[PDB]
Amino acid sequence: PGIVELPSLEDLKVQEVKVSSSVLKAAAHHYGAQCDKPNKEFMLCRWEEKDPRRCLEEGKLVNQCALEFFRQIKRHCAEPFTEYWTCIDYSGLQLFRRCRKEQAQFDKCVLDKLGWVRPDLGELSKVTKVKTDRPLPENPYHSRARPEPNPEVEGDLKPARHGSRLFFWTM
Amino acid sequence: MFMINVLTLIIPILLAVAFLTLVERKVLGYMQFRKGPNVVGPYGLLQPIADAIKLFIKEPSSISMFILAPILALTLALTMWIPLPMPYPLINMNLGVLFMLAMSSLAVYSILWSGWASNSKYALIGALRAVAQTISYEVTLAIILLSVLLMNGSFTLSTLIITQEQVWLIFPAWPLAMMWFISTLAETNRAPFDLTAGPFALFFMAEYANIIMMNIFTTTLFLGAFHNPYMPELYTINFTIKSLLLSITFLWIRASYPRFRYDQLMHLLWKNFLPLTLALCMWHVSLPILLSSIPPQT
């Protein structure tokens, strides 16, 4: 019965930050540090209104923020971040005890030329405030109101009427 | 390269078992005052290859069931070296220790099938008793396995090889390790836990591959080495040396002690191990909840 409407490729023609996930995991704390403040706009939009085809322009927003962060880490300090991800690349599933020395060198890089202190464990937690330009939504489950409440029979009980009203044995 | 991985796994099992037979025969000979085999063949490797080809030569139930028993024993002996974490394991199975235990139970199935297949004899009643003394230890071995992985998060066994490389697991539980060792003595079905017919070479092969499986798993479970990455040969050499020494110690205990009585065996098992296992396992439950060190499953 009910057909849908789905958006075209008019907004789905967007370049992506197509790097591997190993180097992205290597850039976890830092990308979570400076950027990823207005991606919680997208997160709040999605967990309030559970619609994809709703919050997609904020998907473009977080995509261009990650592109900004990647150009910033590309142009500025440094080059041995390349050494860092090719160090942590072949360690099966990545830990952070694996390539610690080059992690410390990249720390010294980012601290001396830009800043960006690594957040302490476990600060990447701790449910976080966000305000939007949109107002917070309403009735997101598309149904009507609940049709009939039970008519609550009230009033205290009257005494017994004509005894039992069975075949006999009144009282 | 997957079938070549299969070849590199299952080709050396034959040379491994035959050379294990010469090693156990020579080491029994030196535990005794017997040099040899060293006459025919240099240090007797021709002697096990002639044992294999001779027992293939010297050959004359319900032909279906008669084939179904040793084919099951041999395919378990082949297929159960897969999740072994010699440094990079063959298949990174998410859970393999209960897989080990279930296929030990399938080995018990193959033994029971041959016991029915031994054609209606007091021999087969003794084979049923052998099934009973085999099955009487998968309780204790599984509960000890549960305790020794209870300090290890999950079944994934690579997290186990992470936890082992700081200190060996023999020091958190040495008597539990010795009890598990006795359980492996009882499950591998050799001396002093005896006893009880073709093909003899294939059944021979299946039991010795079972023993090598348990030896490598034992050397895995309760010890280790510092694992420096991007060179697996270091841990491979050291793990192979300690598995050699553990298997030599296991034959060395197989050599020199008399067998048990059957009711002594059952009475010994239940009324000596099983409350002690329970007390050790409830202690292994109550320990990390009180020492604030529960293992972080990913």
Binding site: L121, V130, L136 | S286
Partner: protein, 74 residues
């Protein structure tokens, strides 16, 4: 005495009894429960910011929110 009559059973009763009793006194029970509770498996959603609560910083680097420090302090 009572000891070497059935010795392994009595030893099992002793170690099992201390395994029962030992949770009733320990300096790490509440520490154990806090370390186990302080590990986020489920993802923390944000929310509509607040009506001015004395918590919940904007940057998680800001230590205004209730956080852990005894993870590093033994």
């Amino acid at each position: 005495n009572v000891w070497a009559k059935e010795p392994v059973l009595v030893a099992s009763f002793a170690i099992a009894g201390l395994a029962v009793i030992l949770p009733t006194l320990s300096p790490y029970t509440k520490y154990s429960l806090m370390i186990n509770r302080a590990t986020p498996y489920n993802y923390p959603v944000p929310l509509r910011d607040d009506g001015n609560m004395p918590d919940v910083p904007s940057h998680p680097q800001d230590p205004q929110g209730p956080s852990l420090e005894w993870l590093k302090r033994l």
